[model samples]
Structures are given as C-alpha cells and as structure tokens.
Target: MRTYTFDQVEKAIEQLYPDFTINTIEISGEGNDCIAYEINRDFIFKFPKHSRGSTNLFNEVNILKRIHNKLPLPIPEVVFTGMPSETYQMSFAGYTKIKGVPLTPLLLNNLPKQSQNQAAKDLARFLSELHSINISGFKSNLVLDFREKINEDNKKIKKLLSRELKGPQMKKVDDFYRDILENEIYFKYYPCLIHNDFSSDHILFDTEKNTICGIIDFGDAAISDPDNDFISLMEDDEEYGMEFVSKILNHYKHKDIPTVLEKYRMKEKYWSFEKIIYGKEYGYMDWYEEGLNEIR
Candidate 1:
C-alpha cells in the first residue's frame, strides 16, 4: 500500500549508485515528510518527498559528511545520496547501518534509578558538545537566530490558534503564547547549534552501552538556541521534566537557568501547538488526542 515500493527504490539506487543492488527493504521509520527504510543489513535509506518545510536530503548528506567524525557519539553515516531517479520524483539518502535499538516507552519502563540518572547526564553531555560548536563552516536553512523565527512562528501560531479554538481555550492558548513571545527579555545567553526538530523518534539508543547511538534527520539542524534540544528532554518523561532540566543546566554550568526554563517553557507551548494542529492536518490522530488529553 505504499506509493513507493522495492521496484521503485531499486531504480533510485541504480541511479544514485550505478552498480549497487538492493537486497531487501523494509520501512524502519517515517513521518509526514520522509520515510526511512532498512535497505540491507549494512545500510538504511531515508527518502523525503517534496513538501513545505521538508528536509533536504542533499543538505543532510553534507552535514553527515561534516559532522560524522565530530559527533561525540555515533550517528548515521551517509553511504549514498539519492538524486532524481526514474521511478520516484522524491530524494533519498542512504546511511551506513547503525547497530542499536530505538528508545521506546517500553524500554523506559522500570529502568533503575541510577540508569535513569545516567541517562539524564548522558543527554546533557550530548547537547553540551553540540552547543559548544562554532557556527562557521556549517551551512543550513534552519533559523540560526531565534528572534525573527519566534516572531514569525508566533504570528503563524496566532493565525492557526484563532481559527482552531473558541472562547476559553482560545484565550488561554493566546495568553500562553504571548507569555512565550515575551522571552526576548532573557535572550542574552550564549547561543549554539541546535536541532530544531528534536524529538524521541529522531533519537536511537543502545541501552546496553547506555549511550545514544544514532542521530538522524538533520532537517532542522542549525546554529541557534540550544534550548530547542533541551525542550526535547523536557518532553521525554513528564515526571522527570524539572529534574532533567536541572541536570542539563548543571552539566552546562549555567547559573541563569531559571530564566532559561521560562524561555524553554514558551518553546514547549509552541511545540505543543504544532504537534496537535499541524499533526491533525496529516491524519495523525495520536498527537491530536494527546494534546486534548493533556489539557483535560
């Protein structure tokens, strides 16, 4: 039932790598914009369809090439870059297979306290290294500066929220977004590279090593507020929200985290909004249901 199939992929592979042959392929991960496939034992292929805000596979290939060795942890390695193929109009990027497991809620179930604490620390270290990098020699379309994007996204949010909510809910979300938009007062902290679309699905973990093994999908990677990545940690486990934030701040040795938290919360609201409304447009009912359930 997928629009693209093995036959289609074979054609793309042939076009991208003249002599390569696909042994097998299965859908590994996917979202509204892209689909990832396990092409073989040693590789994975990510295909992105042309859509607004969709990730550029070419940019991803370049970034992976640039940061492959620079990352503190193992990430996806580009094997081949898919361009125009005879079978499909979309683009794809083949990655070297990462040996690991996805971090699912079931995996987090009944984790030892020490393990959970270590997980927090590990997450901090991962973000810390990336946040410390300078912006030079990096090319990306993601908003490196927060001020303008926040304003633009807020305006888009207002237009969407006004249409989606009525009476009390509308006023509440509006006021909430307004408070978030006011965070420019505390924007003086050092900015660094950020993955604007940081989410659980984008992270792959190897629990045995207690390490994050794979970080794929650079669609939103750019030089900007590191809090974007921090916001993801906050969303990981509801009970660990405050604790995780504190641990990351402690790791970075930042003293003004109270203000940072305030700003991060605002971004959280923005994420929540996009998660529900935007997700609903694509028939993703889980996000819509969760957003409603959370408010209730």
Candidate 2:
C-alpha cells in the first residue's frame, strides 16, 4: 500500500513551494522506493512509498548537497525538502528536473558508433570522477558495505527460493553462493563511494546531441564495492557491453578498474540471483529470464 496519494503529494508540493507556479504534474516514475511527479516539465517532486525509503531520500539530499558541483554530470539538486505533514505521511523532496531521457538499450544501441563511443567515455568519466572524490565528509546514518549487503541479499534469495524454486534450480543457486564463499579473493576489494544503482533508468542522455547530460537518483548511493557501479553496463548486449567497458576502462585509468571488472564478472551468478528474486516478487518475467540467462 502507498503511504501517500497523488492528491496528497499535490497538497504537499503547494505547501512547500508556494512561489513556483503550477502548470501540470505528471507521473515521472515509480519504483519499490519512490513515486515521483514531474511538474511543468522542469521540476521533480518525489515521495517515498514506504517508511524505509524515507532514509534513502534523506541520504540522497545530503549526498546531493555534498557533490553538487563536484562531478561532471548534472545530478539532482533539491530545491524544496518537505517534512511529514498531516496531508503527507512521509518526507518528500523536490528538485529542478535535469534535461534528457533515461538511457535505454534502444537509445544506446541506435546511436552512431562515434556517438556511442563518446557516450561510453562520458559515462566512464562520470563514474571515475564520482568515485575519485574523498568521502570522509559525506556521512549518513546508513552503513552500506557490499560484503554485508550481498550476505543479507543471499538470505533473502534463499528464503524466496525455498518457496519458488526446487531440485536442480535451487541446488545450482546454492552451489553458486558456496563457490563465492570458497573464493573469497574474488569478492574481497577495498570499498569506495559508489552509485549502488547505476543502471539505464538512472542514467540520462540527450539523444539529439548524442551525449550524456545527467545522472539522477542518488537514493542508492553508498560506500560499497566500486565494482557495483559497473554491473549495470554489463547488463547491456555484448557489443554495447564490450564498447562501454572498454571505453570505461580507458577513461577510468584506475589500477583497480580491471579488478572491479573481474569482481563483477565473478559475481554474475549472484547478480542473477538478485534479479530473479526481484522478478519473482514483482511479476517481471523478463527480469527472471535475464537472470536465468546469466546463470546458464
């Protein structure tokens, strides 16, 4: 069940940003964490869907404030922060909308080779810049370490599989987890500030200019395996993946980049497990299929 309704979000926006004129409010996007409304095509008002998401929103605000002009990409800048009110139960955030559409496979695959190369370079630079910054000053109540995170997710996957999977299917996943434990070196790496959810949906691109204009949704930003930032590019088709990874490596110019790539490849099965569990929970068969493909 949703914590707040559209009408309630509207009221909250009016209360928080009284100076801005209202033209229209449209559903921008929704996920397990948040439901956002794009107002007048220039502002985004996002409300947490559940109590747990409130922490992510708060963390996102702090992260944005810390890294506003630090990165090459345009990140979300909170214009209004709305506290819980009688009308809205959860805290909300509003930001000036960044220009460009979410980077999709179709959008990326259709680009000319030159444009595609440039896009990869731009994305690589963005992640490198973001990760290079010292994060000693960026403190949050959220303690995110991928080692513990993956362990917690493994427990969730095991519980879900007991009910949804059986026989060889379950055994394969179990063996995969065991292999990861047995090969600790593959998983062991120094933690860095990472975009925990660096996927196509959060990466924005300007198709007309064939350039990446922005990277939004820092709600999942965390101090974790820097490799986590590269997994989303792995989700692309082989050609795009190779090109993007190659350019990313070239631009990143970090000694750990290769190790991060290796770590990501090593965890393909675990990543697949996560996608499968998410798909089963959400009735997203395509995600389930993708997970199966990875495991196979």
Candidate 3:
C-alpha cells in the first residue's frame, strides 16, 4: 500500500502550506483505511493508505456532505478535501474536529448507571434517525453472500494461523460456517443507510456533559443491514452485554429485535477468525495479533 508516516506528513504539510504554522500535529494513529493527523488540536486531516481506502474516504466525504447537520448528534463536517497529489498517492481530506474521547469499555463501566443509560439512549437515537433518513438519492450495493466470505475466512483461519496449523481440529470453526449456511434466513435484515462501522470506538463521549457529544469515522457508512452495527453495543456474549444492548434496543425504532441480536451474535462468534484472515492478507500485523488473541 502507498503510504506516508506522520514524520513525512509533517514535513509535507510544512512545504505544502508555508504560511500555515502548525503548533501541534498530533498523529491520531491509523484506522484500517486511513491515517489521521490532528493539527493544532482542532483540525483533522486524513490520508488513505491504499486505493480502496481513497475511494472509501471520498465516499465518506460525499455522504457526510449530503447529510450535513441533518442528524441530531454531531458528526464530522468535511471542511476541506484534496485530490490525489504527488506526495500522497491517494486522495485525502480534512475535517473540523469533533471533541471527545471514544466511548471505551473502561469509560462506560466506570460511569454512573444513569450516564450509561443516557449513553445507550444517545446511540439508539443516532441509529434510529440515521437508518430512517431518505437515502433514495444514493445507490447502495446490496450486501449478499456474506457467508461465502465468512467460509473462505474460516478455511484460511484453519489453514494459515500458527496455532491452527500446529494445529487444532477446532470443529467449532466448521460449525460456524455450517450454522450460517443452514440458517440463512436468520441473518436477514431490513436494509437501510447504516453507519456500518457504528461501534463505541467511533462514538465520542463528553466527560463534562456526561453524554455522547459526537461520532467520528463515517468511512464504512453504507446502505446495508441495520443489524450490522448493533454488535458494537456489546463487548462479549455475557449477561451485562445483553442488559446494555437491551437498553439501546428499547429506545431504538428498528424492529425484529430477536433476529437482529441473533444475527450479530453469530457474526461476533466468527469475528476473530475473520479478523485474522484479513489481518494477515492485508498485512495489518495488529489485527493479525489481536485476532489471534481473541480466537484462542
């Protein structure tokens, strides 16, 4: 993948805008698709790591622009965008930054019960408004044959991973494929415009307000199954997980609550294997390592 590190990005910014003085260019690290540079603590610039990432970033900007200020919660406003250039091989974009930390498990757990419930409501409302909005102007690729990818990933997981090849006969993996293939209808969902990557990591929680202040990363926004993002409400298939997700479902307007929960439950079970499959294939060492940690 064509890329640039923060060191080089800083140097390039200096040359690209001689007049603009950057007091602080804090590297916000990498997402799967893009690298973020936060300049002066208020502005964010993102550059794609590969061709697919470039296209995704472009799509995100266009999607955000169309729905600008239409939602009740805060989302990034694409303040500026740059076409493909010499230094950065792929197109990139800038945004007026949204303030707050990601809604992580530690933060969520420590918060008062009221705060947690409020957080759940905030997320529920965001999903309700986002999924129901008029998305007729845009054409969405129907997400089909997801099982095919999952199966392929399952095979790769068994065939490739060190511990697996060493190797465990985890029939558990096979059953994952068989279950999805057998219960195909169980996976069905009413399609809508979804944040697709709607997870807690993208949700920004304000410490002062004790509420969700903003959401970031619209890179995977797509017209797809609304259930695709609900798994984010959970950390694992434990009791508290159900309780937490139940709170969100109560406020959310989407239906088929039973299937929505079940669909993601199965997917989450297969998620780690899928992660390692892509992580190794895409050379994302972190994901490869993280996936290995989870599956074993």
Which numbered prediction scores highest in TM-score against the true structure?
A: 2
Q: Which has the better TM-score: candidate 2, or candidate 3?
A: 2
Best candidate per lDDT, number?
2
lDDT of 2 by residue, 1-296 (tens): 26666677778777867787777888888866678888888989888866656667777888888888989988999888988654334489999998889878788888898888888889888988888878777674444765565677668777765666767877877777776767665557666778888878888988778899999888888877676777666765532465567677777775666666667677664668878877775556888878766765
Give the clashing residue pairs of candidate 2, or none.
Answer: none
- Tell me the whole-model lDDT of each prediction, alpha carbons only: 0.66, 0.76, 0.75
Q: Estimate each model's TM-score.
A: 0.78, 0.81, 0.80
Q: Which ten residues in a row have the lowest lDDT in candidate 1?
A: 49-58
Better of 1 and 3 by TM-score: 3
Q: Is candidate 2 or candidate 3 better by lDDT?
A: 2
Query: Candidate 1 on 186-238: residue-level lDDT in tens?
Result: 45546667766666566677877765677667766777777667666565454
Worst 10 residues of 3 by lDDT: 161-170
RMSD of 3: 4.0
Sort by lDDT, best first: 2, 3, 1
Please provide, for model 3 over 174-205, each residue's C-alpha lDDT reduced to its tens digit, 9 standing for 90 to 100: 66567677886654555678887777778888
TM-score preference between candidates 1 and 2, better one: 2
